[model samples]
Target: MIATKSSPIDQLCAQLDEIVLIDPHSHINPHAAASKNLGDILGYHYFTELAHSAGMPREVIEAPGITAKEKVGRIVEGLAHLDNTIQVKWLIELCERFFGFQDDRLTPDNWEALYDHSEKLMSAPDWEQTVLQKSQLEAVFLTNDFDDPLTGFDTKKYIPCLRTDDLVFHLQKPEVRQRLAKATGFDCATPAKLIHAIGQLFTHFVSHGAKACAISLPPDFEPTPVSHVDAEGPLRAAYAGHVLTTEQSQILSRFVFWTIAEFCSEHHLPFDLMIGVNRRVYESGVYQGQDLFDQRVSLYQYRRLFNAFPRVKFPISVLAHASNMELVSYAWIFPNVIANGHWWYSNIPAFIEPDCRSRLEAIPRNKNIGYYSDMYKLEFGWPKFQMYRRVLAKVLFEDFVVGRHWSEERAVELGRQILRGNVETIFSGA
Candidate 1:
């Protein structure tokens, strides 16, 4: 009922109307996945702790003005309070390692090692090891080493390594799987699932805070060649020739509940509600990942289940990803380029420059099917996605400044200091 054969694209376009609010959910400057993981980059406001109070120490507030020693001192004091907060402390330590005194390298390998290290800390209680082993274990258990104190920071040398595919590939490897499995005791038989779980479990165990947390979709949702192949129409067509089983759907529901239960139990929290947003009724494609579930379909799926499960609480959080902004607005899919209105600032500011805007305004406002390739040049055969990267930078700048506690001038200055180029050098120098 969300959409129909009789519905026109304009009608479908309703989703686009609420574009402003919906777009912000994803694009309000997504803290670069790399920056978030390696540096002190916090997540979007929707999912993170209260910006000012988060990741800060109360002892520092009572202490004298900020200084390297003061920073280190506060961190040491914060450690005791942050024992259960994984991601927050992980990032705190990460920032400290790079930006803290005696700054150290925090490569993707090193980042992964952090999770692995945490696994070791959790599993190993044998205190008889050499000083080095005990030292490493102590550092592992402490978010940061007492020997070197600093904040998390993004490094240029390591940023490129944050590519989603690359990280996923590394986690999918056999050796990494064995180590992770040995530590977490979670069956990581499927490589993609293992990779997926590492990110999810790390996010959950490390920090259950909204912004710092991640939910791992089921195995089928794993992003890999196999899943992509399954996405293909022909492969899906051939597969669909088989009979339907609620088993797949049923497993999804159970695993979702399992995620909730494990997360709550691990953190000693409780959820009085449950929600599911099914995608089957909304789209025809096979579900390679849960993200494939469109908003309309997702909303319907959850509503269907809600009625059937009266035992579930009235206000269930629909555990679904918004496939597109359309789910937000209900109009035409939010224009790809206009993720929230911030898309206006995205890419080259030249596009929205006053003089250029006048020229663009002169042109007929034609409805064009949007793609990255259309607005940017294709000369020299550069990848089309490169433009989106530019968009990403602008988005980051916006998000960076908007939430700052200092004056606009002060915040801008801080941003310059924090986002200075050669992240590795800046981090090392710090």
Candidate 2:
């Protein structure tokens, strides 16, 4: 387990840490995140999931009457039992490395001191910059809305990703149709008009320097070809507050998705599909952005899209552990498809270790967008990247030294490519 100067694993770890990451997917907003406190950071989806899993009651955790300090107190108590978890590991690293706290675990007695220290750090004028510097990020892409004022921050630091979840999921509702029409300056009274609006949104996103088109889908999502004539029925029904059968709605959704693919193909933009997350496990936790994962999804559902859109680049990540092999198979067979990240439930070490191992061994190295910090705040970039590196290093070490005795130089080169090179080449134009 020990790595010396002669060890390839040790060299790989050293070189990987120094490389500036191309964090191709994140939700961090420098302007808004500059003033975030301890509660804001810990309340991100990842931490909330961890705390809830450790038996923290949702009522007290999300109660408006509870003070921020009290909320942190509950999280600390819940997280004490989860010290071995990735969220706890990252919190420990954040407290020790960033806030100068010495505690190995956040106890009731030490939680206040850590919170106060973090608050002081957040008050600094250059705190966000400090975080980005600490993260060693070359560029971070944001999941911005179609109508977002994408010019507020430094474009070089935060790139835009056109998130089309609302379009694909809620286009059936009349209000969504109105909003889309207004945002894109297109009429949406018919299927053709709605398709035109979607194209306009993609053009606007590209004009604003969008690197990708992103969407998240339920486990049951499957896209198939549908013509404009068939889709018009659902479009008209949706606009007039009329209901359509499930099949009718699905046909429309599939047609819209195909439209999105065609636009991406024309614009030469990548499509990011995040699949298999069930939203809102606890109704009370819904407002707090609480959700659960379902691993039942199969990449077989996407075979048609892959075959049809041969020129379109699809970067896909799945929430289900069981689907990893299928995803790898798709990436292996399709030149335009890439397997990306240990997202959501699979982001943990327990899942990432096997998943990363399988991907490295099965797929072409160039086809893997090794890791993305699907982070909500600037502080998360460092810890999430750190976790990915740990899992990646272990996987590489086992594969190279223990399995094949590959040279140190080869290991270092592969490590660099996975950590940063693939992203630079894929997203270089944007």
Candidate 3:
């Protein structure tokens, strides 16, 4: 996206930029939300995966004794093949904004100097505040585990969200059970005890300023209610060090998932369902990049959950681009469903344009979460949101202001609603 003056896209994007964002989803750690140096930025899963795909070996990329500088150099060795990727564009933009990088493209010859120049800025005690202000972020929501203490940082600045994948799918593991026991102080000897323990988690998170409960789902996961009687056997086996059969495991997951939704209903918390990641489908790929979107996943599978919890808001994130229409239909029809930000696999322009426009055209403007950084570091919020805002700016300029003859002020106001307004409205915790 060229940002020259006098262009409608640039003009609209500038208007959108004035919106101080409350990012509704991210993996930010408030203790250290900004990157330390260039290595931390390049070490994001997108870069490592692209580097590995360009023939850098996984062992070298993940070396135990590697210095951050050496790792940045190794990652840069593969950047020539990766330079055309959008992730590379993000890298260059962030460097230019924060590090005074003047190169159009980073290469073997110039990256080291840029790296050294960034060290002092990244080491500042106020770096996180700087990133937040530069990113135009008022606050950002975190991906907290079910057992997370939600302490040591300002909760309003770095908001808490309860992530429940381990609770739903990995509860069969002994260690996860131990974490729950320690966090909630409930002995999970029975189904009733497990549900109580899960409720305790909600109490803790809600007390600590958590605004949502979130989970990642698999393709075949059709959530349905499981009775205490039905969940009893699975709970007993899992707690007693016995293996759960596939049937038993699915049953356990459904029960836990159902319980979480019920708790969300009580807390009036939005349940962020990021649907359809088939784990380890590309086992040899880079860490955190091994999962692939499964086209087989459907929101129809969530009908029962939707029907049961009308008061609970479900901001849904689908993993596949092909699934967006079905998601759009569901969001159109279901009062509780929302079209969330472009997720991991669909976070590119080609997918985002059509999807964003479809949601804008189909649902109420207030029903869409325009974009989230989904970033681990605060530095990335600038680039990721800029990318989305550009796409959004284009969509509004071309499709609405020109195509539909709407005034520029009206269109930017609509952008304001989806980009920043919905987050504050939906997650402000009634």
Candidate 4:
């Protein structure tokens, strides 16, 4: 543990571990996280991905016949085969660090013991505070549904992010429209009313201390502006349960996007674009859902929006590595655009290292938000950021130490910006 110039890499990583993170995105629900059992944690999509890759059967993991504990046991069996993967590594870190599980390998015999210990720990009154404090998370952005009840939680901890997936995908679904109308008490029969309802939701979120409006769009997303008349036609048809053609869907999506952008501009909120998710490629697994990571993402499709709304700030995370260069170039040139996270497939060390390095070299430091957990649970935030910090340390150490391109002080400064500062500034509307 002795510090020295020769061990600068260790020192740098140590610095990163001590730095508090402002997580700009996540799917964590505090109540769920604090109450989650071992089985619930293991069943997250991250573990589901590992279990599937390790040859665990979809039926066993998702079947109603098996008990939750039994499903966890099956997942443990699959996880024993994937101990080297990052997913397993994160689980191990959580177990050892938080649950007092000393075993490195999660065997069937030890899994139950680990589960019991985790259950006890989770039952503690201070569990949430302990996990978050250990995580060093200054704030965590949650992807709350547009119609989600504004629960009176501590706003300083769990910041709300209005998720627009339902708004974007369910425009033609009458039930969804009805749900929106019920939530905002606005008539949804026309484009103007839809815009007004969405604006109301944005205002609601802001009143609850939300900093951003987020959406996960498909790779083929095109921001073609549609007039109120065109959007109204699709809206009326869709309200009657008529499935929209691709063209009509695109038109509706464009109108919504424009509306959202204008709302963000008027209110000074960042619009988060999580691009290129081909959802549910494998339909037989846990929850019968997963994203295809290798799909070609067209980041350039966002140019039209960026052009139209030059004042609205967009923090973008692209799923495909092939889209990396274009995204970095946009962040490099576009003042309103910032490249955010190593998303999904791109979140791995293999991708984050190069992606961080390239963004550091090409884009202004402030134009990158560094990393996002995109995690669905509270425990995941710590381990995910640990992975990010390690890759970031390695990338920076190589640049500053091996390449002799930057002083160690300068490199560390930039690392802090990526991990914390950039996100804080953008989300703070600074």
The best candidate by TM-score is 3
Q: What is the lDDT of residue 26 in candidate 2?
A: 87
Report how far residue 261 has shifted in candidate 2, in Å: 0.6
Best by lDDT: 3
How do these models rank on lDDT, best leading? 3, 4, 2, 1
Q: Identify the superior model by lDDT, candidate 1 or candidate 3.
A: 3
**Deviating ranges (above 4 Å) for candidate 2:** 1-11, 286-289
- Judged by lDDT relative to the true structure, which candidate is superior, 3 or 4? 3
What is the descending TM-score order? 3, 4, 2, 1
- Per-residue lDDT tens digits for candidate 1, residues 105-177, read 3333344444334334433343122211311211110111111112232222111111122122233244544
In candidate 3, which residue pairs clash?
A: none
With candidate 4 superimposed using the best TM-score fit, by how many Å does residue 273's alpha carbon deviate from the native? 0.5
Structure candidate 4, residue pairs in collision: none
Query: Any residue pairs clashing in model 2, and if so which?
Result: none
Q: Report RMSD (Å) for each prediction in the order shown.
A: 22.9, 2.3, 1.7, 2.0
Q: Tens digit of lDDT per residue, candidate 4, span 38-63? A: 87778877787778767877777787
lDDT of 3 by residue, 1-430 (tens): 6546569888988999999999999999888888998888888788999899889989989999999999999899889998889989999998998877888999999988888989888988988888888889999899987777888888988899999999999889999999999998888869999999999999999999999998989889998999999999998899998999998899999999999999999999999999998899998887787888669877988999999999999999998999999999999999999999999989999899999999999988878989998999888999999999999999999988998899999999999999988998989873
- Cα deviation at 16, candidate 4, in Å, is 1.0
* Alpha-carbon lDDT, every model: 0.27, 0.80, 0.91, 0.82
How displaced is residue 219 in candidate 4, in Å?
Answer: 1.1
Candidate 1, which ten residues in sequence have the lowest lDDT sum? 373-382
Q: After best superposition, candidate 4 residue 386: deviation in angstroms?
A: 0.5
